[PDB]
């Protein structure tokens, strides 16, 4: 093996009914979170190579981009942030899963409006709306590349991975579910990043394929 097994700390269950009660009439909302994250771990690299500008000898350009494979019904998003070490990829995956959910949960209840998900933490997990299973592949300069897998039941795994190296970053696999492809065509990612992510300090682009 070397692949590793974790039982979901938190009810996952409970932050998946509490996503799909609050965004299942606008799941289009997870791209909106992922590049959110994005922005994020390239903010936090930018960050770190100002005091140590050796941080960027793992790749130097800051940026998003979107992956759709019809063929294998996939939406990929990449980013070539600060990624994740191990610990950091169980502590914001797993950890946080149950800490903020229940953050997320007490807000909502005193009123706080329901596009605040991203602030507690746990945006990653809207991805479950359209994703019957996510991979997540991520590098950071002080570890090696991890894999993180999990259709959102009662556990996820995380391998060292061996596939392509990635410099630095993270990169997330979306496997939709079958009635879902809407989100590997042009028009609608394009629409979305348009009316969600049009203020991201970052260039994101959106690889067509060919047909
Ligand atoms: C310890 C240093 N590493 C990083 O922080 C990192 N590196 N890559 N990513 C990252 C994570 C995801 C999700 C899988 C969690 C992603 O989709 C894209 C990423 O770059 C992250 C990352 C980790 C956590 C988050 C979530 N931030 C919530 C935070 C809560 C307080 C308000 C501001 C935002 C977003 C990105």
């Keep these: 093996e070397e692949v590793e097994t ?31 994250n994005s922005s994020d771990a ?11 500008p050796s941080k960027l000898d793992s790749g130097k350009e800051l940026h998003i981009n979107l992956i759709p494979n019809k063929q294998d019904r996939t939406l990929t998003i990449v980013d070539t942030g600060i990624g994740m070490t191990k610990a950091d990829l169980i502590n914001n995956l797993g950890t946080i899963a149950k800490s903020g959910t229940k ?11 329901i596009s605040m998900i991203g602030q507690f933490g ?17 590098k950071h300069n002080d570890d090696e590349q991890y894999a993180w897998e999990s259709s959102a039941g009662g556990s996820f795994t995380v391998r060292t ?18 009635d879902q492809t809407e989100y590997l065509e ?8 348009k009316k969600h992510s049009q203020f991201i300090g970052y260039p994101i682009t959106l690889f067509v394929e060919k047909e």
């Design 122 to 138: 746990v945006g990653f997990y809207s991805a479950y709306l359209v994703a019957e299973k996510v991979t997540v592949i991520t």
């Design 186 to 193: 042009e028009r609608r990612i394009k629409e979305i990043v």
């Design 103 to 113: 953050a997320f949960m007490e807000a909502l209840q005193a009123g706080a409006d």
């Design 42 to 52: 390239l903010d936090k690299i930018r960050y770190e190579s100002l005091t140590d």
């Design 6 to 36: 974790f039982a979901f700390q938190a009810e996952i269950a409970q932050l998946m009914s509490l996503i799909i009660n609050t965004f299942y009439s606008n799941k289009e909302i997870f791209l909106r979170e992922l590049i959110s």
């Design 161 to 178: 991975d061996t596939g392509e190296p990635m410099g630095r970053g993270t990169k997330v696999i979306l496997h939709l579910k079958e």
